[PDB]
């Protein structure tokens, strides 16, 4: 059965059908209303419980098989005043000294050495992107009716690793994560990718730098595919698209290269519901013929009324790692726009140049080529990340 | 990540004391909570992101303490801990407990057992959490 | 876990990847560069020392090979020739070659290194002395423009900086090979440009301009989420920042 | 099977067969004339020759491969004494390298010498004759034996008729030990 | 050490009957008995003479019992 379980502790889980998983979840929630995207009543102090008592006590009595008086006593006993050690007017910026928490002791030890004139700041804690995105999207609703999340829709958290890999660290990975809906097709996710490889350009133009190519790689090549459970999902919507998976299949199945038999399908043929996929287990996505991304399904859960209900933002980026800009070697401060080879002036090969430095080093006022070198346009993946 | 730097010790101490009281009443848990002042944990110069992650991980750890094989009293204490953590947080919107598919039906069965056991305090607290919809319907906690 | 790093699928027996796809071959024919080409490793002093050793070794082989090959040939001919006068002549040539070998062995390393523009066995150096870890052209450039001793490695004097600033304006901050030649301190175009740009008011602006502000605002509004913005990546679009 | 571009072996390891044989032949001839083959199994020596050849023909990559890797690629078992023969032949190569003007200044080593086998074998005859004036022999005996076949003391004397008699009493059992032997293996 | 002492006790009680000593030893073969003899004789010529003079009782049960006990004790302590 489609019963999720760990394959390795807190690293990855058993495979299951996403559609069956969603149906099993909805079966355990349909008719109760806990899954609905409507705002429910909220707990409050006993001093203001009178208004909600009529609506709540009868339901409590029905569900807990207790009397209405017992429901009222339970509501009185479990009031928030028995737990709110903090008044609603207290600011979160100060540690309350009247506490026995070891956690707040450690927090005090952290804050005490961050109050000197050299250390006092309101700077980043450990990262920024997550809360900015959440506050930008959490709890919002769409401006169009067609852009509304359906009730009980599955939210899938998909990590896509960058093509630029560290090659020196292995604990953390360079990745960006989208939330996607079960009913979405893989075409939408692929079209939502803003990877720099689509912007790749080249060609040798040392003689005529203004003749840079008019077409980015996205305009030249549109091949892209996902790979799950041994199945390739190749895009074929446009004539520039080609079935990259066929070459991989021909190469891999001819020898005991360590992988089993695969099968090819179109990208429009499957929704996220149709996938039988693991959580945490790495998978593959590829585009532009050579740009491979590792795919990790970090999380899957049903939509909740506090979540981002605005479809226009989906696939909704939910985490993003950082890459450094390729600073040109001339000034070593500014970001490069060009790269040269066989350069008679550069101290090293390849050498990176900015749009100013390249032009006013390798050319004169009339634009005539100076010295001997080969030069190519460069788009920085650290910039367009 | 696993756990905050210190939360596990405080949670273990509070749950151990609750168990040692040999009582399941919510009154005793609230007395311990107010004596030790657990609710203050969500103050202390935590920025919104720090607060969101801290609430997520605290709720996850409390859910781990709430699941079996822990016995009746300790599970009840962990449910009270979950309730306190969720309802004393300062997030906007409120952060939810991560609940797995393999755990939701077991927790509903525990709610039914609590109702059958005539210990309505824990069942009411869980129903109040459901009214707050404190639970995310995830695959893992 | 970590096995799935790019390339995601890799051969279990030999570690090779798939053959070049048609899209990749067509990209290569168009000359579209890959992101893996931007990986550059800094030159450690150990690499510089090994390069000095490799260049002096190459020059030493180049000087010795003629002399010792002639010595060996003369010794062969002496062994196979029975004529006494010819044997003595061949022995004399062998002794002369031996003395020349000894003289070359006694030459200092500075003489062996020779001039900046002298010829070297660059591709052999790259592929046999460094096992191909750095390309032949890369090694050639690094040596001839930074490592060879005739390059002016000395720190910039204040008079040198002031003259560089003054003379750059005459040429329009342009044609830096001629600027470096006219400066008269044996600097290169790249060194002069690097020094100028690191101390250039026109590059490292303190003021602002209308188009910079407009386009900065445009990129910020496009890409900002909440309190986060791409501070140092917007530097790509507007010129003259870090 | 290195000479075929089979999928099992990377094409990087493929090479022309004729020059393979010429290099192997000259290495084996060097081993033969340098005393390595007499009284010893030739197969390990030929294995070492082929391996140093395969390394020396592409130092850039094949210098990083070990004999286990090469034999795995070839699907040929490697004799255990092949490693010792390879070490001895590399020692011979270092003894040859000490004469050449450039090699002796470059201060080579066991691993680096493999990229000069070409010019070492180009001028083999003169260098090996000069080195022989420094021969090769089993290292077990080359440890500078001060004494060689010492003359033992003369002990051909046999006495007159009997030099001793208590030995016979020493070599016979008492009734106790006689009975003990009877019961030892009963 | 104790193996050599037992071997010396055996040469005392039974003489240079290498076959029976090999048979009573748990594992040692005849060739090993000969090799031990060749190695020890140089420094223990006096001790083998003492053994030949020391015609100690070669009882079966007693020798088996002390063999087993001392072997077990050495194996435990080593
Ligand atoms: Zn990409
Ligand atoms: Zn510049």
Could you explain the architecture of this structure?
This is part of a larger assembly, with chains A (385 residues), B (141 residues), C (242 residues), D (186 residues) and E (78 residues). Chain B has 141 residues and is mainly α. Chain B contains six helices and two strands, in the order ααααβααβ. In chain B, helix 3 runs antiparallel to helix 4 (72-88). With 78 residues, chain E is mainly α. Chain E is built from four helices and no strands. Chain E is globular and about 30 Å long. In chain E, 14% of the residues are buried. Chains D and E meet through helix 10 of D and helix 3 of E. Bound molecules: zinc ion (ZN) (2 copies). One zinc ion (ZN) binds next to strand 11 of chain A. Residues 331, 334, 354, 356-357 of chain A line the site of one zinc ion. Chain A: Part of the SNAPc complex composed of 5 subunits: SNAPC1, SNAPC2, SNAPC3, SNAPC4 and SNAPC5. SNAPC3 interacts with SNAPC1. Chain A: This is snRNA-activating protein complex subunit 3.
Q: Element order, helices and strands of chain B?
A: HHHHEHHE
Structural class of chain B: mainly alpha
| Chain pair forming the biggest interface | A-C, 82 and 64 residues
Strand percentage of chain B lies at: under 5%
In spatial order, strands of the major sheet of chain B run 1-2
Percentage of residues assigned to helices of chain B: 55-70%
Topology as H/E string of chain C?
A: HHHHHHHHHH
Helix vs. strand class of chain C = mainly alpha
GO cellular component, one term (chain D): transcription factor TFIIIB complex
Keywords (chain D): Activator, Metal-binding, Nucleus, Oxidation, Phosphoprotein, Repeat, Stress response, Transcription, Transcription regulation, Zinc, Zinc-finger
Subcellular location (chain D): Nucleus
Protein name (chain D): Transcription factor IIIB 50 kDa subunit
Name the features.
5 chains; C: 242 residues; mainly alpha; 10 helices; 0% strand; D: mainly alpha; elongated; RNA polymerase III type 3 promoter sequence-specific DNA binding (chain A); DNA binding (chain A); snRNA-activating_su3 (chain A)
How is the topology of this model organized?
This is part of a larger assembly, with chains A (385 residues), B (141 residues), C (242 residues), D (186 residues) and E (78 residues).
Chain A: E1 6-8, E2 12-13, E3 16-17, H1 18-27, H2 50-64, H3 68-77, H4 102-112, H5 129-137, E4 154-161, E5 175-181, H6 186-192, H7 217-220, E6 224-228, E7 231-234, H8 244-252, E8 263-266, E9 276-277, E10 282-287, E11 291-302, E12 316-320, E13 338-341, E14 351-353, H9 355-362, E15 374-377
Chain C: H1 22-30, H2 45-80, H3 84-106, H4 109-113, H5 122-129, H6 136-147, H7 158-170, H8 176-183, H9 189-198, H10 210-223
Chain E: H1 2-14, H2 18-24, H3 30-53, H4 60-77
Helix pairs in contact in E: 1-3
Bound molecules: zinc ion (ZN) (2 copies).
The site of one zinc ion has 6 residues of chain A, from strand 11.
